[PDB]
Ligand binder design. Structure first.
Ligand code: FES
Length: 108
């Protein structure tokens, strides 16, 4: 008698594993991971304020193209990203969307 929302998010460890964490259209990257005890030692640190450059993640196909755009500043911080794929960018921002229902990501 109020409301309820929660999506599913998957994170492929840099080792090749796969973590499962449910977000919630409106949440905020990092928080979810941090909420999962961040099982990806290396993820963002600065909270996503652009002062760590230890973030950057890979988005699932058809997902990255859905994700919102980014500025030039963040674009720079998205450079540090390793093996910048065709769907890799700096995360720890924006909020989950219905287009993220079971969104899979990878940790390069
Ligand atoms: S969390 Fe430090 S820039 Fe993304």
């Amino acid at each position: 008698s109020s409301s309820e929302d929660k999506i599913t998010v998957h994170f492929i460890n840099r080792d090749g594993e796969t973590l499962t964490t449910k977000g919630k259209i409106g949440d905020s990257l990092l928080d979810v991971v941090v909420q999962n005890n961040l099982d990806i030692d290396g993820f963002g640190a600065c909270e996503g304020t652009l002062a760590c450059s230890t973030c950057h993640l890979i988005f699932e196909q058809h997902i990255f193209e859905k994700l919102e755009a980014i500025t030039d500043e963040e674009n720079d911080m998205l450079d540090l990203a390793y093996g910048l794929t065709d769907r890799s960018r700096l995360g720890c921002q924006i909020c989950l969307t219905k287009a993220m229902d079971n969104m899979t990501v990878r940790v390069p």
